[PDB]
Design a protein around this ligand. Structure first.
Ligand code: O6K
Ligand code: CL
Length: 305
């Protein structure tokens, strides 16, 4: 019993963090086999941000311009390389601590654990969701860039995020491990803004199921609805459209609780149109959309890694 925001254990990923310096610019990298992955903007000083010609900057970078450090150990940098927004530094030394891992690309709505790091040293672990506007509500200070986001499949680390920038509103953007941004952003200092955000409907539903499971069910009622009847009511409260794909995945939680997705939906319609009426749900005074279905099975069934 209980239900918390909950991150994967970070130890598998702690052992992969290094500190990359390049002139004045120190940030964090991810050491796997004989290869460190970091943001290409490590080559840049605070000047170069306005319109960086990354190529012609990197063309003037000797491998002895790149310092790498795993704790108290320096590596010999031997080969560089640029792929999209991620720079690949090649080192004499494979990483003893390298776990099994697939570079993957999450879609908006999917959650992951962020290991905030500074100077290649881990500070903290927390959960976020890739927002539908392709941003994240992180906590990052200067030097955080290179910090990565990740999920775990028993023993395999699926890295899905490298951190690159803060947007006007105090929200954050970055890339997959191939160095492609989530959403429309670019890695220079221009006018860029998040764009309008929506509530991750399927995740809010999973939350409610999690709530039912932990004996919180005042919010329940004696009716149902249809998808499209609901998808009307949702858009008028700036919720995402609930796709048959989203019902499929909510399957397990529907099964276990003995509640049809579409009955829960009706309980949502109520809450949007009426509020919580001075009440909490799993001790929250508004609707939580940063727990996926899997994160709810994970935590209430108690999977391990
Ligand atoms: C990241 O590059 C980083 O940590 N770099 C190392 C560093 C060392 C010493 C001093 C500064 C930075 C930062 C991380 C940012 C800063 C604070 N919180 C973060 O998430 N990213 C940037 O600085 C980023 C790099 C650009 C994409 C390639 N950047 C540069 C310039 C401006 C902004 N953002 C911005 O102007 O928004 C507000 C909040 C309005 C300042 C930016 O994110
Ligand atoms: Cl709250």
């Amino acid at each position: 019993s209980g239900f918390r925001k909950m991150a994967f254990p970070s130890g598998k990923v702690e052992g992969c963090m290094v500190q990359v310096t390049c002139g004045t610019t120190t940030l964090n990298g991810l050491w796997l086999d004989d290869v460190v992955y970091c943001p290409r903007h490590v080559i840049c000083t605070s000047e170069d941000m306005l319109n960086p010609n990354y190529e012609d900057l990197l063309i003037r970078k000797s491998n002895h311009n790149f310092l790498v450090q795993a704790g108290n150990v320096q590596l010999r940098v031997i080969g560089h390389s640029m792929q999209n927004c991620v720079l690949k530094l090649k080192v004499d030394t494979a990483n003893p601590k390298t776990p099994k891992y697939k570079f993957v690309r999450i879609q908006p709505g999917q959650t992951f654990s962020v290991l905030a790091c500074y100077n290649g040293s881990p500070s903290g672990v927390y959960q976020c969701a890739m927002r539908p506007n392709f941003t994240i509500k992180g906590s990052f200070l200067n030097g955080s860039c290179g910090s990565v986001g990740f999920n775990i499949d028993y023993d395999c680390v699926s890295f899905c995020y490298m951190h690159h920038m803060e947007l006007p509103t105090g929200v954050h953007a970055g890339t997959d491990l191939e160095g492609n941004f989530y959403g429309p952003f670019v890695d220079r200092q221009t006018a860029q803004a998040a764009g309008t955000d929506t509530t991750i409907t399927v995740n809010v539903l999973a939350w409610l199921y999690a709530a039912v499971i932990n004996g919180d069910r005042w919010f329940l009622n004696r009716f149902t609805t249809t998808l499209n009847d609901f998808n009307l009511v949702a858009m008028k409260y700036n919720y995402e459209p609930l796709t048959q794909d989203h019902v499929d995945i909510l399957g397990p939680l529907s099964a276990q609780t003995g509640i049809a997705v579409l009955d829960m939906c009706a309980s949502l319609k109520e809450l949007l149109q009426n509020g919580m009426n001075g009440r909490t749900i799993l001790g929250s005074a508004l609707l939580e959309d940063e727990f996926t279905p899997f994160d709810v099975v994970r935590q209430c069934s108690g999977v391990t890694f």
